[PDB]
């Protein structure tokens, strides 16, 4: 998923 990819960066 797109959103999950960015949220991994934030976390």
């Amino acid at each position, epitope marked *: *998923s797109k959103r999950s990819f960015i949220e991994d960066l934030l976390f």
Partner: antibody, heavy 121, light 109 residues
Framework: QVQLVESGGGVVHPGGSLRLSCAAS????????MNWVRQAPGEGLQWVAI????????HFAASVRGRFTISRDNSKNTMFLQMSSLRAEDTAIYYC??????????????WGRGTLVTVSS | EVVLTQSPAIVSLSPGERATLSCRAS??????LAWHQQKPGLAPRVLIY???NRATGIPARFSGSGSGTDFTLTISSIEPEDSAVYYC??????????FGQGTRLEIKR
């Protein structure tokens, strides 16, 4: 209407374990990251934990890290906070909440009713 | 990481006057700051989001301002019903949410 209802509060012996659940309704649960926030008997808000919309990203404040685990089920619109090795500082009212997300346009902020946890022999 | 400090600790004011509550961040958080209201005995309720925008059902006497490190919440026509504790909360570090210690508004009579 949107509603967040916490359950599982109670007295728990020091060093013991307790499992808190948050039931969501009225909004697309699976779209929101979910937080836990706690409040000591006369003190202010203290952020505790966050669980991502999908559930593979978790974070915990340092004071509860290694003792708390977090889970969510998007088919029941429920989330669970599993507390262990509980001590006096964990005595609080516990809220579940969405706190704005990470988008440029902030996502809505919902607050639960809250549940009381007392750590006492 | 982003510490929020709130001033004053307590503010006592007569109805109809204007309150100004301050929230300073240890590092820039842009406009990603929100204000919550808690009347003790009840759960919190979001008041301002994105540092200046009102939330659902919030009357127009409430107003937020600022960006970066300094932020203010302004209440213009204080009502007795505004007797409450106000918290600021940043989302700039979105995996790491933080709250300010709180500011209490007592209504003079």
């Amino acid at each position: 209407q949107v509603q967040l209802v916490e359950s599982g509060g109670g007295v728990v012996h020091p060093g013991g374990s307790l499992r808190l659940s948050c039931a969501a309704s009225g909004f697309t649960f699976s779209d929101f990251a979910m937080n836990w926030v706690r409040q000591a008997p006369g003190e202010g808000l203290q952020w505790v934990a966050i669980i991502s919309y999908d559930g593979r990203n978790k974070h915990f404040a340092a004071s509860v890290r290694g003792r708390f685990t977090i889970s969510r089920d998007n088919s029941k619109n429920t989330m669970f906070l599993q507390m262990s090795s509980l001590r006096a500082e964990d005595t609080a009212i516990y809220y579940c909440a969405t706190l704005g997300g990470w988008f440029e346009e902030a996502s809505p902020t919902y607050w639960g009713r809250g549940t009381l946890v007392t750590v006492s022999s | 990481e982003v510490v929020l400090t709130q001033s004053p600790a307590i503010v006592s004011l007569s109805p109809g006057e204007r309150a100004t509550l301050s929230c300073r961040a240890s590092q820039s958080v842009g406009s990603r700051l929100a204000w919550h209201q808690q009347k003790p005995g009840l759960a919190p309720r979001v008041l301002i989001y994105d540092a200046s925008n009102r939330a659902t059902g919030i009357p127009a006497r409430f107003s937020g301002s600022g960006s970066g490190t300094d932020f203010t919440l302004t209440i213009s026509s204080i009502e007795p019903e505004d007797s409450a504790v106000y918290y600021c909360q940043q989302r700039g570090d979105w995996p790491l949410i933080t709250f300010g210690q709180g500011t209490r508004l007592e209504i003079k009579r």
